[PDB]
Enzyme design. Sequence first.
Site, mmCIF file in Angstrom:
data_model
loop_
_atom_site.group_PDB
_atom_site.id
_atom_site.type_symbol
_atom_site.label_atom_id
_atom_site.label_comp_id
_atom_site.label_asym_id
_atom_site.label_seq_id
_atom_site.Cartn_x
_atom_site.Cartn_y
_atom_site.Cartn_z
ATOM 1 N N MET A 129 0.887 -1.091 0.098
ATOM 2 C CA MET A 129 0.132 0.041 -0.115
ATOM 3 C C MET A 129 0.998 1.110 -0.014
ATOM 4 O O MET A 129 0.360 2.049 -0.762
ATOM 5 C CB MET A 129 -1.030 0.094 1.065
ATOM 6 C CG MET A 129 -0.530 0.499 2.775
ATOM 7 S SD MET A 129 -1.711 0.362 3.710
ATOM 8 C CE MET A 129 -2.970 -0.735 2.953
ATOM 9 N N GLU A 130 2.108 1.401 0.549
ATOM 10 C CA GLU A 130 2.653 2.391 0.755
ATOM 11 C C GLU A 130 3.560 2.503 -0.741
ATOM 12 O O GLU A 130 3.683 3.704 -1.055
ATOM 13 C CB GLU A 130 3.780 2.543 1.941
ATOM 14 C CG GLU A 130 3.288 1.925 3.006
ATOM 15 C CD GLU A 130 2.160 2.633 3.702
ATOM 16 O OE1 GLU A 130 1.750 3.681 3.127
ATOM 17 O OE2 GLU A 130 1.427 2.176 4.692
ATOM 18 N N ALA A 131 3.716 1.669 -1.206
ATOM 19 C CA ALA A 131 4.441 1.576 -2.709
ATOM 20 C C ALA A 131 3.381 2.125 -3.515
ATOM 21 O O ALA A 131 3.743 2.843 -4.523
ATOM 22 C CB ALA A 131 4.806 0.321 -3.009
ATOM 23 N N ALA B 84 3.025 5.891 -2.878
ATOM 24 C CA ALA B 84 4.365 6.735 -3.649
ATOM 25 C C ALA B 84 4.225 6.816 -5.137
ATOM 26 O O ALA B 84 4.324 7.877 -5.606
ATOM 27 C CB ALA B 84 5.593 5.987 -2.961
#
Lengths: 200, 178
Positions: free
Chosen positions: A192-194, A197
């Site tokens: 999810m953070e990738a 980003a």
Amino acid sequence: AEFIEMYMGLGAARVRDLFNTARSVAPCIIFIDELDAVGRQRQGGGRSNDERDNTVNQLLTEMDGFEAEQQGIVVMGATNRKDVLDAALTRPGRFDRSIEVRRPDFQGRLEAVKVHLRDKPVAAEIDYVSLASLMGGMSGAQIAGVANTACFLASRDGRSEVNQTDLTLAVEQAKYGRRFVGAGRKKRFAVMEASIALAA
Amino acid sequence: EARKEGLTGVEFRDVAGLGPILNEVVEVVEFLKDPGTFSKLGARPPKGILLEGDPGTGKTLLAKALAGEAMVPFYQMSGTEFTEGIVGLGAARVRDLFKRARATAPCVIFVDEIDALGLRRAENDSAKTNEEREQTLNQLLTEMDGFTPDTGVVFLGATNRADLLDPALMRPGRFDRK
């Protein structure tokens, strides 16, 4: 907090004795901490408002009062918010100047980082502007705390002082804190953070 | 006489289920073992520590383990130990105990259910029963307020209800940690 007492009529006694000793040893400076916890606005409220109010009344007749003065003695108080105290106290003639104490600025941190290590062992490869721009938003007590923590981590490491790299870790763990996360829940975080980003 | 447990024989294996607490206790036991180097740190040790939480979790199981891992005299007894019904003598037990600590410094002083001393005295009950509890209150107040940070007398305090606390011992320098 020394004026907080649930007996009948001793708060005014403490105010009176304090002010009489101050008048006897004039000139003076009378500093009262925890003012925000007694001098809030008077109201009906509970039964404490029968005596807690009375206490404040004594105060209102010492800084201005009768007798027109004692000497001109300076009185100062530590409070966190001026709007909580009633209008009778903070009015001019009982508190003329109102000054503010904010968190350390860039310059304040620039000089408090070094002034807190004058009595602390530390090395030469340090740039105080880096830590002055690196930990903006903490209080001075927190700067003392991060210095304490870097020194103690040096102790636990065997060295006596600290270079940049480890006190940086100390301040970053004073910000974001220091739990076990499984290996299946970790790839969800990663994915999810990738994706956030990549979108941003 | 306070039960002088010279040797307690308690280690950190004598406790279980308190991982997160294990690392804030090694600081205290290292200060107990090294009373002269922490003054070289410029930092001040915690004078008193309050054991707050549910009963049956191991306060004295931890405090006695702290004193054992320090290998230093341990002084534990009750909080009502000074509230037995004769006026003024409760101040002698506190005085005797704390000067025992001064004489065998460094030392540990522990008082389980200590809040019986620092019971926030409500205005609903007897009065002379108040000035004795408050008498012992001010007694240990003077005792530890006149103490030095590096005397090696670490103050252990435990009770299972932090709601009945009196604001006096919550002051900094009296219970520097909880």
